[PDB]
Paper text:
We tested the AeGe on dipeptidyl peptidase ([name]) crystals using two ligands which evaded complex formation by regular soaking methods. Given that 4.5 M TMAO is approximately in equilibrium with 80% r.h., the equivalent accumulation of the [name] peptide in this experimental setup was theoretically 90-fold, resulting in 45 mM peptide as the final concentration in the crystal. Similarly, we determined the crystallographic structure of the AeGe-soaked [name]–[name] crystals at 3.0 Å. Interestingly, the binding mode of the [name] peptide closely resembles that of SLRLFLYEG, first in the anchoring of its N-terminus to two glutamic acids, and second by the induced-fit formation of an S2′ hydro­phobic sub-site to allocate the F4 residue. In fact, the only sequence difference (F to Y) does not provide further clues, since both residues are exposed to solvent without forming strong contacts.
Here we present the development and application of the Aerosol-Generator (AeGe), a new gentle soaking device that complements the humidity control and uses ultrasonic vibration to generate aerosols of ligands to soak reservoir-free protein crystals. The AeGe technique uses reservoir-free crystals under a temperature/humidity-controlled gas stream. Two protein model systems confirm the advantages of using the AeGe method in challenging complex formation scenarios.
Author numbering:
A (entry chain D), D (entry chain D): 1 to 10
B (entry chain A), C (entry chain A): 48 to 105, 109 to 139, 148 to 897
Write the structure that this text describes.
């Protein structure tokens, strides 16, 4: 699916 | 009304500001407890009724447990203490599965549990481990030591599963084949010899026990084998374990090349990518029959295939969406779609449909005729739709009381246009078709008569069955718990209703919060992860009980807190949910972040963050201070931030979602502009001369469609990992929404921004493209081919590449760079005083 | 001094301006005549002495001829009329060879000619053709029809060559093997079975008759086979034709992947790319002995190999730089470098060194012992150097008068430090080493004593031997014509000198013009293509003659114009060549484009265009109005434009070129800043606060080194297709200048801008990267890996990709987009009034 | 060699 993922955190 | 101009900070200052604002979330971004399980202590003298096990972050993600008291002091609030279950001690296929499952975590993603023995089974890095707790062995009072399942296999073992019939046995996948391993006797056998690890991809395209790319990416199925839950006994005092498994052949599937992450090497990996219109993999069911002797030694392994081909028995089927076994183990079930994804079928498959594999054509013919003609596929349920079938995880089968009937609950949108529960009973007829006659079966020869179809729920609201949402079925009190949108489309709540004499849908969760709920298997407890716009996520245990006068009526009571809310963080000002009547007839909801220190007589620039794609809702009553924290940061710098759930987004029923069938790109920006203009008429501070639009993936797709269709409204567009060309995207997704390219020539053409490059503005500093260089889902080509046409059309662009990144941001430095560049681009080309002078 | 700010035009206006300025060069960019050849008419009664054939653009590039009168009317100027020789009628390997040879043209690139028969042979698209003129067959007065050499071969035929011994026979390469074909009898035979076209690259890495990548890209050798010029006769009345050929095995060479141009496919091609430090291909000589009967039918083909291995006979050799035959055909010669490229060897190889190939080890041993021990490799010349050997095309061998002596001219820089001609005679001794003894030969066992080494030229100036520059040797009058830099380093001129009693180097070309010259084989005529800063290219024929008193003295006289100059085009204001004494001791030359309409009291922004790499000189007295037209366009918009030939550039001798040995990147920007500051002290109008720097390839490399080392001087940098990391670039180039990575750890580190990402500025709009996405020479990785480190270092960049482009711009829309973006970037971030406010 | 080529003209 066209769903990006933001799971790179500091 | 004078224009507000944002503080023009330098690159180094913006980096500072972004660092300091992020630094107040060290305590935050620690993911909530999940994968809950309840286990009874069965100790009449002891002070605890249950023990719960769950995965959580203490660093890595591990197994914890907590104790459930028999009674509580209702004066004070009990905080359950977290007890570590374990003691303190990526490959390519793990890296890809973490993209397919959208897992951001580190450590243990999931776990099996055999109830009868206490056996936990879980993967953790390369290792497959086990521990015991809560079986006959009893309950530990201190950390257990994980016991590595040893192996001869050289490469990573994926997808471990305990045999429910025998907890000594497990199964895993290694180099695209199914193996089994005994955790007591250390015996290790390969069950399938379908893939050769030493060969190339181009010659060896077969696998077994694995879900292919499209199934992982588009149907959320990440496994291709299923243990039979019961073991047949033999005259020896041994047993026959069974495993249903999917076998694929990707020979005819096209081969794309994606850049390897080791950029040094300057090479590229082959992927089998079924692009739209082309061949999907060739699938079929198979079965592995494993004879175990008295003490757990493998006597023999017989590999069995379908009596006739898959294409003949299950005519029309392209995708095995879901599969498993009935609780008795008598039938293997499967949910089957056609290519268009407008016809679902639930089909039972008897183990007697499978016969041993034989190369000898003499021997094979004796086995075929020896199987009875009455043994046949049984289509127990079928449904069609004009729009599309949304696959979900709801499918519950009851113990088979009568011989030739099967009773089950299923969810569907094909009747009303909203997903609702339906109890169904089908009569398992002997089929009209006979194999002796030597013909092919006609379309409906395997269909079963529907004896009963009672609708359990109904109305202008949907039951949830994705992303963990499912149903618990209390077979004693004859109830069914489920999650739904009945009270509001902006709030998920837990409901309960009778499945025999249905009527009163009783809500169990408290209003003003959206909930995510896990119900105990014993149905005497449930856990809710809840939040709202103001208050961060909380996790609480509630006890379920009935009044003495009416067991059907269920009420709840707070028992204890599993995770306490950190509280409102002073930096985060939440957005205000608004709504408006669109000229289409539907009510569309939105979110408004007003600028901080809003001065009267001044109008502010406006970033519109967007997704607006299927299977997603951005606007709801959940805490957005974690994931969408930087929308508040934009509001702190003096940007209006809008977000609108346009037609096509989920949780509003099938007609609402089906609004862009065949027409992706064309309808969405109207809804966004409409909602944006409704606000500017209502608010003096929204500057419509300086509007930005920004989104990722489908949001990036629409960010381009906005600038293309409506350059009058949108000054700038930041398109992240956009689809520029639908013939490039895969079958499972794009044919579901847009059909086959031949049968929608114009939709594809108008949906593809790379075909319409000349319609972009001829003024620079308005189009910014962002893309992960290693993207295997939305291939970089989308951007590279778009840029190819922009160059020929004489149009300007700005480009930022993230070379360590796929269809996600995982390396933290990439995300820091992105936020920094985004703010600086918005500042230099929209917000600031210099941005005004540039035009 | 007030700052001048350039006219801030929009993107659409700049596109207009760029179109209209380019539109006045429709008549221009029609390449000059080339590949000249003279042929005597031998008609005492007829009015013409010679006929000349040459390639030129009429559209496509074809064969023309013109007539040379016996006498001229010296009152008027004769314009030779161009007569079409032919009548009016890309694959992957053609596309790549056009990158390797740097061919921009369309049509016929080159042609063979057998003198004795009149036979022309040439490739044109996929076809190999032939025509006849000037042999016994006579001279046509009208267009001939090209005669296609028919074939059974399915794929493109590359590299056709006429057999000089027999013009009925040709040879070509097809699917990396050598074939022959008779153009009368239509017989077609494959001579080598080394490559299998149907297999993959990874299994089948061998080829024959072909120059591998590094030889094409770095040594300008584009062929790997050579016809023997004489045919041995047999007792039958038949003959034995011979072909020396190089055979490669690229199995151990690394495999990179480059994106395929068909972006739709989303695939990638394998290339064998010997990156620095890794294995070069494994080469060897072989020979094909072809027995032809009385009437031109192939009796048999014997394939022969070296009697001992290549690595034993030619100890130390990595590259076969050049090869061919002596005019007699008695020996096959070769010029051989070692890996470091600090040792050259000229080596004669007798055909008796080659023995037939035999699988049978019994049969093979009889053939080895049957060959005499006296037959041996003959190193006729050897030279070493601290710096490097520059390979050139000068090597002339005289008819062998004495038996055990060979006389020849060769050019070298190893004595004086400037390339000069030397007549040499070597004594062909029987070697000390004997094959019967059964040992390996010691380092210098094949060396030949130098009987004579007379230097023909000398001084602080060099003979030219690259890019068509060579020598004609008049063996009657005992002279040698050659091109050189004696009168000036900014002007190439044609010289002549005696090779027996050398002394007076007589210049033949007129001063104030740089010349490119082709001398007739009969030495009674020469053609000069000439130009200077003001006047465009012209092509004229000059007649050579001696005074009666002294044949050694040569004078010239204008005969006729082949191509007339279009004249000074009013848009183009040429640059002024300046120079300055650098603190290194060397004089460095430069070019200054002053701004048009230079107003006093105002200081202008300054683009410094740069290359500053080896094997190239940008500053000289040649017409720059064609290739560097847009430097004038920048000067018309009000930019100062500077260009400086720093240390390392060519035409100044080896010491000057060797200035950056091991130290690439470190010295060049000092020279540029020095020359730039010399100008600003001398001129009031040079604004040093607003300096841009821009270059392609090595110029792009230095554009980054400038911004990295000297952010104080350079405001912006536009780096096109830069090398960011030297471990990625190939052996042949990078080991020549920088050595092996192990033996220059620091040079590589300091030469690689990707290792020093944190040294770039933390202010945006200063770094712009440009790169062709399909670049096979400077792989895109250079940019992608540089960007990877810039993201981690938190540094900003701007990026433009050209997806249809390799290490060149060929699609016209790409070049239009580039110039447009360049002007707009310079305007927005350097030149304009808004560029001042941005800081 | 590190030598770019501009032979795409209109
Ligand atoms: Na997925
Ligand atoms: Na070359």
């Amino acid at each position: 699916s066209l769903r990006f993922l933001f799971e790179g955190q500091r | 009304l004078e224009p507000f101009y944002v503080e023009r900070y330098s690159w180094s200052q913006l980096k500072k500001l972004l660092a300091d604002t992020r630094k107040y979330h060290g305590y935050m971004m620690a993911k909530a407890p999940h994968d809950f399980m309840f286990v009874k202590r069965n100790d009449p003298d002891g002070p605890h009724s249950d023990r719960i096990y769950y995965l959580a972050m203490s660093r890595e993600n591990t197994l914890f447990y907590s104790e459930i008291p028999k009674t509580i002091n209702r004066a004070a609030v009990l905080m359950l203490s977290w007890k570590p279950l374990l003691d303190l001690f990526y490959s390519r296929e793990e890296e890809l599965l973490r993209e397919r499952k959208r897992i951001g975590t580190v450590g243990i993603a999931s776990y099996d549990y055999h109830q009868g023995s206490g056996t936990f089974l879980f993967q953790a890095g390369s290792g497959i481990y086990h521990v015991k707790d809560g079986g006959p062995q009893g309950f530990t009072q201190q950390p257990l030591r994980p016991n590595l399942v040893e192996t001869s296999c050289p490469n990573i073992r994926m997808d471990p599963k305990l045999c429910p019939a025998d907890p000594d046995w497990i199964a895993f996948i290694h180099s695209n084949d199914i193996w089994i391993s005994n955790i007591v006797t250390r015996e290790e056998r390969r069950l399938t010899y379908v893939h050769n690890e030493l060969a190339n991809m181009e010659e060896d395209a077969r696998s077994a026990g694995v879900a292919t790319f499209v199934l992982q990416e588009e149907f959320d199925r990440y496994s291709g084998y299923w243990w039979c839950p019961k073991a047949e006994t033999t005259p020896s005092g041994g047993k026959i374990l069974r495993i249903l498994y999917e076998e694929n052949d990707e020979s005819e599937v096209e081969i794309i090349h994606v850049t390897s992450p080791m950029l040094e090497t300057r090479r590229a990996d082959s992927f089998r990518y079924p692009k739209t219109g082309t061949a999907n993999p060739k699938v079929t069911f198979k079965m592995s029959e494993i004879m175990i002797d008295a003490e757990g030694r493998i006597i023999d392994v017989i590999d069995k295939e379908l009596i006739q081909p898959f294409e003949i028995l299950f005519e029309g089927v392209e995708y095995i969406a879901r599969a498993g076994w009935t609780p008795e183990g008598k039938y293997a079930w499967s949910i089957l779609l056609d290519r268009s994804q407008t016809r679902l079928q639930i089909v039972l498959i008897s183990p007697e449909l499978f016969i041993p594999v034989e190369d000898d054509v003499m021997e094979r013919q004796r086995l075929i005729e020896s199987v009875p003609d009455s043994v046949t596929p049984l289509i127990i349920y079928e449904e069609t739709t004009d729009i599309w079938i949304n696959i979900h995880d709801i499918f519950h089968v009851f113990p088979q009381s009568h011989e030739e009937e099967i009773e089950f609950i299923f969810a569907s949108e094909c009747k009303t246009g909203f997903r609702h529960l339906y109890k169904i009973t089908s009569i398992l007829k002997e089929s009209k078709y006979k194999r002796s006659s030597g013909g092919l079966p006609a379309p409906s020869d395997f269909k079963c008569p529907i004896k009963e179809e009672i609708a359990i729920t109904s109305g202008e609201w949907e039951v949830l069955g994705r992303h963990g949402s499912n149903i618990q079925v209390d077979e004693v009190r004859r109830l069914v718990y489920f999650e739904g949108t009945k009270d509001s489309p902006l709030e998920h709540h837990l409901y309960v209703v009778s499945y025999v004499n249905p009527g009163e849908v009783t809500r169990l969760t408290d209003r003003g919060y959206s909930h995510s709920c896990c119900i105990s298997q014993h149905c005497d407890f449930f856990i809710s992860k809840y939040s709202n716009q103001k208050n961060p996520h909380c996790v609480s245990l509630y006890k379920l009980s009935s009044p003495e006068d009416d067991p059907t009526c269920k009420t709840k009571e707070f028992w204890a807190t599993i995770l306490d809310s950190a509280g409102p963080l002073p930096d985060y000002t939440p957005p205000e949910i608004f709504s408006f009547e669109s000229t289409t007839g539907f009510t569309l909801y939105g979110m408004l972040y007003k600028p901080h220190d809003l001065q009267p007589g001044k109008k502010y620039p406006t970033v519109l963050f967007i997704y607006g794609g299927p299977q997603v809702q951005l606007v709801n009553n959940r805490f957005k201070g974690v994931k969408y924290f930087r929308l508040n940061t934009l509001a702190s710098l003096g940007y209006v931030v809008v977000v609108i759930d346009n037609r096509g987004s989920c949780h509003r029923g099938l007609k609402f979602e089906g609004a862009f069938k065949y027409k992706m790109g064309q309808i969405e920006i109207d809804d966004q502009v409409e909602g944006l203009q409704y606000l500017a008429s209502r608010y003096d501070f929204i500057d419509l001369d300086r509007v930005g639009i920004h989104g990722w993936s489908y949001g990036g797709y629409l960010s381009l469609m906005a600038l293309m269709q409506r350059s009058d409204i949108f000054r700038v567009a930041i398109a992240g990992a956009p689809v520029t060309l639908w013939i490039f995207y895969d079958t499972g997704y794009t044919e579901r929404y847009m059909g086959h390219p031949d049968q929608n020539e114009q939709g594809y053409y108008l949906g593809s921004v790379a075909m319409q490059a000349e319609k972009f503005p001829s003024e620079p500093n308005r189009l910014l493209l962002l893309h992960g260089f290693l993207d295997e889902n939305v291939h970089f080509a989308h951007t590279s081919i778009l840029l190819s046409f922009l160059v020929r059309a004489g149009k300007p662009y700005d480009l930022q590449i993230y070379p360590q990144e796929r269809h996600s941001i995982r390396v933290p430095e990439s995300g820091e760079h992105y936020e920094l560049h985004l703010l600086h681009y918005l500042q230099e080309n929209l917000g600031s005083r210099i941005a005004a002078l540039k035009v």
